[PDB]
């Protein structure tokens, strides 16, 4: 799964939006056709989702963002060349997504996000 999916996925149990937190066992770089993402999901709270992703992928060096790259995107969302590259240019093959409110876990296995056979963490 490419990180732009974090704008599109939600916890299937919580009846309100929550934050899905990424844990990454392994990730590969992908070549960066149409790349549309939900910009507001990545701008809110001064780029909280992006900061969360950058932390989740800190042991992955195939692609990178910086404090500035994020702050500047929050300023001028129109300049998302670096954001797109991060959000579309990485693929998590092995890992997990965890709802920050109820702890529900979506495993990521072979790049597929698994939302049917879930795990509890709370």
């Amino acid at each position: 799964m490419k990180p732009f999916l974090l704008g599109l996925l939600k916890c299937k149990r919580c009846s309100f939006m929550t934050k899905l937190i990424l844990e990454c066992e392994k990730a590969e770089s992908n070549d960066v056709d149409v790349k549309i993402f939900n910009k507001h999901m990545f701008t809110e709270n001064g780029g909280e989702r992006l900061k969360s992703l950058v932390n989740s992928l800190r042991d992955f060096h195939g692609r990178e963002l910086s404090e500035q790259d994020i702050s500047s995107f929050v300023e001028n969302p129109g300049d998302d060349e670096k954001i797109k590259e991060f959000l579309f240019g990485i693929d998590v093959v092995e890992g997990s997504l965890r709802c920050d409110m109820c702890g529900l876990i979506y495993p990521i296995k072979g790049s597929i996000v698994e939302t049917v056979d879930t795990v509890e963490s709370k």
Partner: protein
Amino acid sequence: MDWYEPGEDTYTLMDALEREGLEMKIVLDLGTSTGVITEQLRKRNTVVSTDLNIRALESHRGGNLVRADLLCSINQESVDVVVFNPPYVPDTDDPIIGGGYLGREVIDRFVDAVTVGMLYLLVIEANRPKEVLARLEERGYGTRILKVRKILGETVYIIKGEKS
């Protein structure tokens, strides 16, 4: 069958999508199976592709893959369009093709959960297309039958739904 393979039904949906010229959208290919429709959609759009069937996802043409039950794990506010060739076969609850009573059980679940601005849905005569249109209207969708086509076995209806 391990997964649903492209048939005349899928190609009538694809033909209708082609004429619409969907472009620059975020599109959810629901029940993507092995991604024949995703393949066409991704040329002009950003596509998320989902299926209940993991085997199909594991042999997918390629895309952004989510194993999910309809839309529960999808934030629909983030999606522009949903495309769905649903399990529509009456009187079976086979997990791939089965629509149970009237072949409508999954269709009806879908219609009652869908909130995106635009949708393309495939149905067959046995599903009672008019009841589907009606349910969609009740959910706030202006509807029209984009295309009708007789294929081997039955007649296919492609429903286009749009909120005002």
